[PDB]
Amino acid sequence: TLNGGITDMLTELANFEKNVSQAIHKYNAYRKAASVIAKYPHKIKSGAEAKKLPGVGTKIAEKIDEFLATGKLRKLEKIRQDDTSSSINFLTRVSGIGPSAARKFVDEGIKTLEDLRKNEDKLNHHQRIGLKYFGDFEKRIPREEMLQMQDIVLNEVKKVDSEYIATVCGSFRRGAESSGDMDVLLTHPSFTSESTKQPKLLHQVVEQLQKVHFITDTLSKGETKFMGVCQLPSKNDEKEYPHRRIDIRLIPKDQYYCGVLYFTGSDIFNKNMRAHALEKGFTINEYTIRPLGVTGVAGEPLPVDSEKDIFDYIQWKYREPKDRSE
DNA sequence: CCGACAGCGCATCAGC
DNA sequence: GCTGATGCGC
DNA sequence: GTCGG
Ligand SMILES: Cc1cn([C@H]2C[C@H](O)[C@@H](COP(=O)(O)C(F)(F)P(=O)(O)OP(=O)(O)O)O2)c(=O)[nH]c1=O
Numbered sequence: 308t309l310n311g312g313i314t315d316m317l318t319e320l321a322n323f324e325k326n327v328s329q330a331i332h333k334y335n336a337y338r339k340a341a342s343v344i345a346k347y348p349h350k351i352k353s354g355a356e357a358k359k360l361p362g363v364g365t366k367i368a369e370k371i372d373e374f375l376a377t378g379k380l381r382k383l384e385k386i387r388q389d390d391t392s393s394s395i396n397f398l399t400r401v402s403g404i405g406p407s408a409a410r411k412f413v414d415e416g417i418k419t420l421e422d423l424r425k426n427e428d429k430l431n432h433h434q435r436i437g438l439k440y441f442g443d444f445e446k447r448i449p450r451e452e453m454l455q456m457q458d459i460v461l462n463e464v465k466k467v468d469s470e471y472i473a474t475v476c477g478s479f480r481r482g483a484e485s486s487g488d489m490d491v492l493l494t495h496p497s498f499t500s501e502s503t504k505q506p507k508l509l510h511q512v513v514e515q516l517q518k519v520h521f522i523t524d525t526l527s528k529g530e531t532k533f534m535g536v537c538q539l540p541s542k543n544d545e546k547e548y549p550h551r552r553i554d555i556r557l558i559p560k561d562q563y564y565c566g567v568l569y570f571t572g573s574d575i576f577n578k579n580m581r582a583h584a585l586e587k588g589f590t591i592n593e594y595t596i597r598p599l600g601v602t603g604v605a606g607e608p609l610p611v612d613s614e615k616d617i618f619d620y621i622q623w624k625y626r627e628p629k630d631r632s633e
Numbered sequence: 634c635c636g637a638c639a640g641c642g643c644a645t646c647a648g649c
Numbered sequence: 650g651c652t653g654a655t656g657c658g659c
Numbered sequence: 660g661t662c663g664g
């Protein structure tokens with residue numbers, strides 16, 4: 308927040324480029340510039356001081372000078388006036404609705420929260436749940452509740468099979484005081500990169516969490532990734548907790564460190580680490596870190612026994628989770 | 634100037 | 650039904 | 660939109 312007014316602007320621009328313009332790279336340009344400025348330990352005094360940072364070019368430098376002088380951006384003031392942009396930007400806030408679907412609905416006069424409700428018949432299952440819990444999903448989750456959710460999950464998983472290991476990652480693992488949602492990494496000995504000595508591994512867990520009314524709805528579900536909704540139980544007379552989004556990822560147990568690195572984030576951090584790895588002749592995904600052959604082809608998985616080992620390969624000092632929030 | 638920009642799971646569609 | 654592309658999400 | 664080469 309030291310430079311909150313500039314990062315907000317940039318984030319607003321990034322949102323415009325992704326949702327409205329469908330220009331994914333401009334989106335990431337802004338997001339990176341926002342990220343790099345957010346960690347600058349000084350109160351930026353000009354766009355030139357900002358251009359010194361990597362990711363901030365001429366254009367963003369001008370926009371920053373404009374913002375520093377007036378306290379706003381003409382481009383955004385205008386963008387805020389345009390009804391289509393206002394609408395499309397808003398519809399994308401429903402989980403399941405992206406830039407494409409947003410622009411489509413608008414082409415049908417469906418541009419408000421109310422228009423969606425009366426037109427629920429035109430939503431796929433995901434967008435339906437998104438709309439249903441639109442309010443709740445915008446709320447943040449206090450670490451204290453996160454801690455309660457962790458308990459329920461770890462204990463319920465334990466009851467399905469003592470060999471399951473559930474790790475809450477995301478901003479939670481990064482030490483955040485509040486989280487947008489709960490991200491859960493799941494491993495079991497019966498599922499490695501070598502074999503799936505047992506099916507329904509993920510299913511049985513979703514099943515158990517649904518049975519104890521923790522999981523309330525499903526957005527999507529596969530053999531390795533679950534995307535849904537959950538809710539903490541409330542006390543007698545106690546007002547209900549907001550519903551919460553929950554992601555669960557089953558990863559081969561011999562690939563845990565690459566998997567936990569991935570899920571811990573942040574998303575920008577992973578982008579930067581993965582890009583940096585490429586520059587060092589490596590490629591990293593949630594499963595492994597392979598070498599890039601002379602021809603670019605990804606080699607075989609490199610032995611990994613800790614998060615740090617991965618960091619070593621790309622010659623990066625180990626950074627704790629709490630320092631990966633970019 | 635110019636190509637790269639991280640990597641992948643799930644739902645859904647088109648074409649077969 | 651499949652594969653492969655696309656949209657949307659992590 | 661920004662970057663390395
Ligand atoms: C969105 C996304 C996510 N990730 C990885 C890192 C996140 O920590 C992790 C969790 O995905 P996420 O979508 O839950 C998150 F990024 F928002 P998170 O960092 O948890 O913050 P919060 O939800 O706002 O509390 O998944 C990527 O690698 N790329 C992406 O584009």
Ligand SMILES: [Cl-]
Pocket residue numbers: 561562563564565566594595611612
């Ligand atoms: Cl690993």
Ligand SMILES: [Cl-]
Pocket residue numbers: 592594595
């Ligand atoms: Cl792999």
Ligand SMILES: [Mg+2]
Pocket residue numbers: 477478486487488489490
């Ligand atoms: Mg999260």
Ligand SMILES: [Mg+2]
Pocket residue numbers: 477488489490553554659
């Ligand atoms: Mg998540």
Ligand code: NA
Pocket residue numbers: 357358359360361362363364
């Ligand atoms: Na720069």
Ligand code: NA
Pocket residue numbers: 398399400401402403404405
């Ligand atoms: Na959306």
